[model samples]
Target: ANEVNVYSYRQPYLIEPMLKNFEKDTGIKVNIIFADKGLVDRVKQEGELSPADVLLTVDISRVMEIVNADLAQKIDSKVLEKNIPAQFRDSNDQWFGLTTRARVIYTSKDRVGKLPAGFDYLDLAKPEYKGKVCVRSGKNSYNVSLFAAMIEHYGIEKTKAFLEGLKANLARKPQGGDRDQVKAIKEGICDYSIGNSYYYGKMLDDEKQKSWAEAAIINFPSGEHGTHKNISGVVIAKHSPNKANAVKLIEYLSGEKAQGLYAELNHEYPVKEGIEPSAIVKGWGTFKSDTIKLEDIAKNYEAALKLVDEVKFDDF
Candidate 1:
């Protein structure tokens, strides 16, 4: 009769629905600690007495951080390995990805004759896009991870210059989430913006956000670096009190039923094979996701943050 306790970095709304379904089917009550701050330390503080059974987070870096801190135990779920592709999961099996998002270009269909094809093209904007691009703060984890991957793929110097060039295109100071950037494009605030693929589905689903969706076309970036992609994944707390139930939950999430809820509702790509992406996501078409291991992306995060500072992105 022990409840499954969860500490999640992903916004509650995005995950709660799936939890509800999990609860309904399994009859296990779920208790969640939803926060935007200090989840790693929070779990560390709880130590052996921690009630958390599962730790869920939005990006690979956070999940990897927990793994590095020794806060998670290596999971041995065969279902997880067979379902989530190797590129998206931990090589040592400490964590398993549940869902994925594609970070692609959101361009003003009317202004730019053609969308810049890739992350590399974003830098080519230089002085031309000054005050013409909309992005979130460099401090945002998603942006940090994206730039971090760039640094890992490209070199440090090139990545720094790319940030500076990208900053020059700022329509205003970096602010808001991906969806706001899309809204700005519609409002004529900026000709181009950065966004996740799922936001396109969100816009289509909500009447209020629908107009912004109308203003832009989903464009996949090409060339060397390919489209930036990241995942939402889960890990078992190192001393989880309910190890059996926790494993069951993680396995369930990796299975088709939960993955479908993730895709149809969150508008994300399922990590499992055979499950089709949400209809809206499929409509955006397919592209090569950078095959870099998720761990490598997490490993170089410090260098990437330093690159952000080196370029003085805040000033731009």
Candidate 2:
């Protein structure tokens, strides 16, 4: 009852500080394991014997993977509900987002032109922008979730078209981190790229990459729906032996202290509405986030993954 076990897909450098502070604040020992992959399968295999009290991961699909695998239990924490917005939490209360970030586009300052009326992500796929766009692989969890949101908003058929066109427009074979895409813009290898919102801040604040950040402008490609966004979130394990301790830790994480820690460490917008983003992130003007529930986006994840392969998005 005095300790909680956490299985985290996020790096220790990002989440550990918050966990340590929780341990200090609550007198509850925190036991954590960090893995880049397979925590879900490991938990499912452990089944009833799993000691996993909470699961922390980024991206809607990652959280949904735990939920869909039936490895997580619905949390009934009023603190979680109060801290995170309804759009960022599961309707079934199975997960709560701790931080939020948008999937954004970056264009070269040199490529500036009159803005189109309501430019959308779909617009980047148009022939007009062919050979000018760059991005990471479609299979990347962030892109997968963004693609899933497209399916959630515009349906699979149109999403397929979007993927195919985006593929055709690639300035290069999709191969790099979001920050690398910004580098591409600086190199004049591409005129535009899609990347996470926080990476803009990360690069802008980093000494070596500030030039790349300076060369590009962040854009929120709002469509008929809105800009696609995603979250970093937590869920309780289905068979948590430390259920009480887990709830306590999760509540602590949803509180102001952890929320502010997230903003400062990773440049993500805190899921707690009143918690402001890091100053660099705050400088990027806001846009309307698509109102679709992440669960609905998760519902389309499988279909979106299939569309990515079906269109041979990376082959080009």
Candidate 3:
């Protein structure tokens, strides 16, 4: 009856099956405290008394929050090193990316007749696309991470200009989740928007959202380097009471079977090489992911947020 506790920002259903498989294979009981927010604050407040053995979450920004708060411990695991690419994990081994999803463009089939050759993220900012873009708040983790990537590639002043141009192109004020951005296209509120690749798969799978999926095609945008990719990752809790079991759980989750299951469940590409994304996801086609290290992106997150506010990206 060995056990470990997990504080997960990932929705329960999305991760439960993988946890169940781990339980079955390892005979370790898994206890998860699931929440949409504040898992970091909860862990920090509990300090050394926190029972959280593992911290799992979607978005690199969220994982970095925990790492920044000093709530995660470095994990030196051969399994993790062998499974995850260096670009996707912390150099210090404090966190490891389990799955990745590309930030891509959703173009309206009816309004945008033909996609521009080599459509890139910077295109959304062009005067030609004015008043035809939709996005969530610039402060959202997804966009912040994307902005960080832009800063990494384009440098600060150029990235600032890009953001200002993109903001000027907003069809409506920044609002809603990735799905909502697609829904806006269906309703003719806008002709284009940016969202993660997995949201496309989720839309296709849902009866209500299928039309939204049909209304637009997913476009992978690349820079001079490559397309930007983000991750959902895991960390061992700093105060993990069951350290050995927690490491086992981490290895189990990083292994081939769990990686495959996790990626398929979320409609994301697995961090581990050789595992194909689900059929619906594969249909979106592949492109070269940007080579910018996520660690560099994390380093620039603070500046990205400041630029977002400085430009009033969400105010529009």
Candidate 4:
């Protein structure tokens, strides 16, 4: 039987639908092993005996983990290159981004009043907004990636200053996932928070979370460049036993049909250009995404983490 084996960090429901579609369309079986963590280490430990033909993960860091481990193979596919934006894919073609999520601000609709003029991400650090910002731990991948982008734009010293300012402006100690920050806003814990754009859609889908989603407005903050975006992406394993089928599956996922399903299912921006996001996502409007290469972003991961510690962002 022709088959492809996958190791994925994405929740099963999120990617299973698309896999089922792929199996139905191509008559190839897909075997999936899902886990919240350690997929990278497992692939490395298995070495050439690993059955994983493809690996899917929710952050650029995880994708890079596979690449840095020397566990992924470079794929030379015109289909992938044509579909994914250059900024979203690895320069070496070792990984390809399937979806993007913006790091956006969520402001309380009531207490926040009109957003101050010329509001941007750095404004979270301003003295006027002292005790108004909420965020997750700086160590979290989402914040780390956002910080990496800041370093890319502002340089290390300025990024450090910005982190210090942001820490001083915090309404309370950093805590919770992105959705929880919005929940905090609805509960009157804070007036503003930073989080990924897709979580707003997820909040709206749950009956218990609808009020939280409604209480906050999404704000896409642009620096001198553009809004910061991060990705969830895929890689082919270095020792794929079914290389041809794996490549075909990857190509199919990058096509319009699968890209649309991915956007609709996950509320993410499709990496393939021109694919419309789900209605809820579309309502958030669009902004110019920062064009910093993801590899460049990955390059700064360690320095970003060190800066986070240098400022004690989560310690506050």
Candidate with the greatest TM-score versus the true structure: 1
Per-residue lDDT tens digits of candidate 4, residues 22-77? 99999999999999778899989999999999998888877887899899999999
Candidate 1 per-residue lDDT over residues 153-245, each given as its tens digit: 887887888888888778888878989999998999997777788878988889999999888877767868778888999999999998888
| lDDT, candidate 1, at 313 | 71
Q: Of the candidates numbered 3 and 4, which has the greater TM-score value? A: 3
**Candidate 1: where is the Cα deviation over 4 Å?**
113-121
lDDT per residue for candidate 3 within 1-316, as digits (tens), equals: 4999998887776788899999999999999989867889999999999999999978787888899889999989898899888877899989989889898889999999546657788888999989999998998888989999888888899889999999999999998888999999999999999998888887887899999989997888755666788888999999999999999998998889998886677788888988888998877777878888777777788889899999999896
lDDT of 1 at 156: 82
Q: In model 4, which regions exceed 4 Å deviation?
A: 113-117
Q: Where is model 3 poorest over a 10-residue stretch in terms of lDDT?
A: 113-122
**What are the lDDT figures for the candidates, one per model?**
0.83, 0.87, 0.87, 0.88
Please give each candidate's TM-score.
Answer: 0.94, 0.91, 0.92, 0.90
What C-alpha lDDT, on a 0 to 100 scale, does residue 155 get in candidate 4?
Answer: 88
Clashing pairs in 3: none
